[PDB]
């Protein structure tokens with residue numbers, strides 16, 4: 001094993017920071033990125049506390065589809081990264097980079113990445129110590145005849161150099177199963193046997209109409225737990241709103257895949273945090289997002305989605321490392337072996353822990369994410385673990401998984417009910433994680449959570465998550481319900497028919513909209529109410545260390561009922577929020 005170029009694990013998580021090449025400007029002799037970020041400027045902007053956990057991911061986007069274009073662009077940017085000087089200290093501090101080397105099956109009619117040989121990648125790794133890895137993303141819809149063979153070579157060249165091969169894919173058309181050899185293409189299977197410690201496997205939740213979110217995430221987790229990948233994570237994509245045909249928030253009717261650039265702007269900001277919790281709570285540690293202009297920003301500035309949701313979430317997962325492999329193994333009661341593609345794909349989990357076929361959220365944390373690996377793989381390394389002795393490893397073809405009802409009846413024997421209410425909640429140590437699981441329905445949810453004898457009842461609007469930690473002197477609360485008003489994008493359309501017929505915003509138009517109406521002159525959402533009721537409290541709690549998104553919250557209201565030893569906390573806000581309540585139990 002050659003020494004790893006960086007650590008990627010629960011204590012050293014990874015936020016990929018995408019920069020997409022502007023191929024139009026490349027044709028004009030310029031080296032630029034869509035949205036106006038620069039490599040140096042973006043890196044400089046990254047808060048210093050996050051720099052150790054953040055890597056610039058170059059993507060070749062619409063560079064010309066000809067030999068040399070991607071190499072030229074990439075070499076230019078690798079040089080810029082390598083030569084970077086920290087202005088505050090005058091020292092050369094090479095910027096860490098991941099290159100996107102494979103996408104859309106590397107077809108020459110789809111991507112300039114086609115013309116990036118493994119020889120060239122090896123050369124770049126050897127020339128640039130700051131090249132930490134290479135990335136393959138989104139080939140499920142164009143599963144090239146040699147994709148597994150190519151993937152083996154990317155993993156091997158990364159292992160040769162101590163870098164990581166990172167692959168983001170969704171289980172559409174059995175993609176994840178095929179990657180590991182389902183249909184007899186076993187080169188990557190063999191590569192992973194040798195080099196899994198240099199592999200990161202991520203979901204890519206883009207193709208949302210196909211509903212493969214839960215099954216792909218199950219596989220990512222299972223592959224990690226069974227030593228087929230070093231770590232896992234996910235790429236969470238606001239284009240899901242386009243893929244599923246949604247339009248104005250909460251509006252009825254479906255417009256199909258007709259208004260892409262309006263659609264990728266509309267997903268509520270805080271919903272990205274809801275998605276990211278599924279990674280974190282299940283031991284994943286690598287995070288990436290699209291569309292980058294909305295999820296990260298433009299012109300070397302942070303979007304509000306980034307500053308108020310993603311940045312704060314990522315800081316949280318650094319301060320509170322995700323559960324380790326050992327911990328997740330100890331907690332796992334059921335591990336599935338077999339192909340979801342033969343058991344309804346995403347339908348497998350509908351009415352088990354997801355509320356519908358097309359969602360990136362869960363409706364209960366009772367089972368967490370049930371880990372699985374494809375049928376082609378073996379569970380030998382899983383069983384060799386000192387931490388796997390109490391796991392029931394079950395074939396997906398088992399009677400226990402034959403129907404929705406059978407799944408719950410089986411899982412309920414091993415995963416006890418641990419809260420009440422129709423809401424998502426999951427407990428880790430002294431922390432309850434809660435969110436409203438509605439996607440595009442304006443419906444409040446309620447739940448009853450306990451910390452031993454202390455009862456906490458919550459009421460949440462959609463697009464709201466919270467983290468409630470019992471601390472020695474009371475409760476720490478982190479709340480995020482940040483959701484700006486996107487109705488302006490949908491003006492002039494009273495119904496779905498009209499919305500479908502709107503003029504296209506276009507890619508350039510959406511970037512401009514972000515600049516003119518999101519980075520500045522933002523149409524913030526209305527403050528909305530969250531309720532928290534604590535029962536079993538001695539005296540009126542005190543509030544401490546209150547902070548959050550500027551101008552986004554009223555002072556929380558505390559109403560203590562001495563006779564009933566309870567307090568009702570009413571919050572009116574739209575943003576991230578943090579505070580501690582200090583109290584004793586009765």
Ligand SMILES: C[C@@H]1O[C@@H](O[C@@H]2[C@@H](O)[C@@H](O)[C@@H](CO)O[C@H]2O)[C@@H](O)[C@H](O)[C@@H]1O
Nearest residue numbers: 059103104137138206239240242243290
């Ligand atoms: C092949 C992929 O292209 C880009 O993503 C596409 C988006 O640009 C958009 O068209 C959505 C629509 O749902 O589909 C995408 O496939 C890249 O961002 C991605 O990394 C792939 O290269």
